[PDB]
Structures are given as C-alpha cells and as structure tokens.
Nucleic acid binder design. Structure first.
Length: 173
DNA sequence: CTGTCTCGTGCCTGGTGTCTTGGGTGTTTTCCCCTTGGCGGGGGTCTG
C-alpha cells in the first residue's frame, strides 16, 4: 500500500469492468484471474495469458457436479485459444456452491443501465458461480445452457463414464 | 486453574497434472501402370 501511494503521489492515473482473482480452472489447469472488458475477457495466469473476445464465444454451459457440491462453468470457444502445440476448444471452470463473493463494477449506475440494460447493477453479491454466469450472460447475450429433464438413478444430473482413456462426467443437455 | 483437541492462518515443497516427444499403425493422396474403348456383264442356286 505504501508503494502504491508513493506511485500515485507522482503519477496521473486516468479499465476492466470486474476482476475475479484466482478461479479454479480445469482446461486450462491452474488458478487464473479474469478481467472483464466490453468486448473481450483477459485470462491472466502466473505465466501464460490469453484474451478471448466475446465474438469467439459460442455457448455457456453451467453444470452441477455428480456429488451436488460443485458447479462446472464451460465456455465454448471459436477459434480455440492456442498454446504452443495445443488448442483448447472449451474453457472449463470449477466453483463451489459455498463460495460466495461480493463484486462492485468499475462503472456508474446510469452507464451500467445503458450497457447491460439493467441486467446488472453497480454492486452485487451472491454465489461465485452465479455471479460469473450472470456477468457472462449479460455480456454475451447468449443464454446459459442448463441441464435438461434428465436425472440418473443416483439422483445426479449426469453419468460417470470413460472416454479416451480418462474418466469424466457426461451431461445430457 | 488447566491443558489437549480444534480452527485458522503462513510457509514451503513435493507431489498432480499435462505439454511435448517418439514410436507403432492405419489411412489419404499422388503418381504410375494395365485394361478399355454408279453402271454393267456374267455365274450359280433355289422354286414352280
């Protein structure tokens, strides 16, 4: 804080709409902060960084976990973000239902009303996954797909099955 | 009084996950190759 104050005392600072710090990502793997912009999102990592325009997004999927304790937030990309010799077709995020948050936008009330048409507010609070879903919806306009009318025998909304030498969850959307 | 189990941080390190690479192996992709696509004079032969 002292260094920041010393910097501000000499600089003339004039941005991101909202910044989520450290969100459990599964594809790619690791903790990544997410900065929101009017036309894209900056996925900042401890080493690698990516920038996904909203024009590249195709679908947003919000799925529950088999144990009913976690939430999967999937973003379908196009073109896929590239990293050396690998291309990711989906951005997967993992959240916990008991992981709340309180966010405040970097905009004013009237500007938010004009931009998001009242879909968002200057200050919000609620579950982390709910907040991310609401923000991404208000940004992309695409509706977030949710599980259908399927309910497995174990009461879960998916089936545990293998695929390409790897276990995982299959959701009938 | 009292101290042992528990919650809640710091700290760090070592253990998880996955790019990246190499080998095995089936499959397309071109080029090459093989199969294919007017007039007359006679003669004899058959039928009645």
């Amino acid at each position: 804080e002292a260094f920041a104050q010393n910097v501000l005392s000499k600089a003339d600072v004039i941005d991101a709409i909202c910044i989520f710090r450290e969100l459990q990502c599964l594809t790619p793997r690791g903790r990544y902060d997410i900065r929101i912009y009017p036309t894209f999102l900056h996925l900042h990592g401890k080493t690698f960084d990516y920038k996904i325009p909203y024009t590249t997004v195709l679908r947003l999927f919000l799925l529950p976990h088999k144990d009913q304790r976690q939430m999967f937030f999937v973003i379908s990309l196009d073109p896929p973000i590239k990293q050396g010799q690998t291309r990711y077709h989906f951005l997967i995020l993992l959240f916990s239902k008991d992981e709340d948050i309180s966010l405040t936008l970097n905009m004013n009330e009237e500007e938010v009303e004009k931009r998001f048409e009242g879909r968002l507010t200057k200050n919000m609070s609620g579950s982390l996954y709910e907040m991310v879903s609401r923000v991404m919806k208000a940004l992309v306009n695409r509706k977030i797909t949710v599980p259908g009318n399927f309910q497995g025998h174990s009461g879960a909304q998916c089936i545990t099955c293998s695929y390409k030498a790897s276990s995982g969850l299959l959701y009938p959307l």
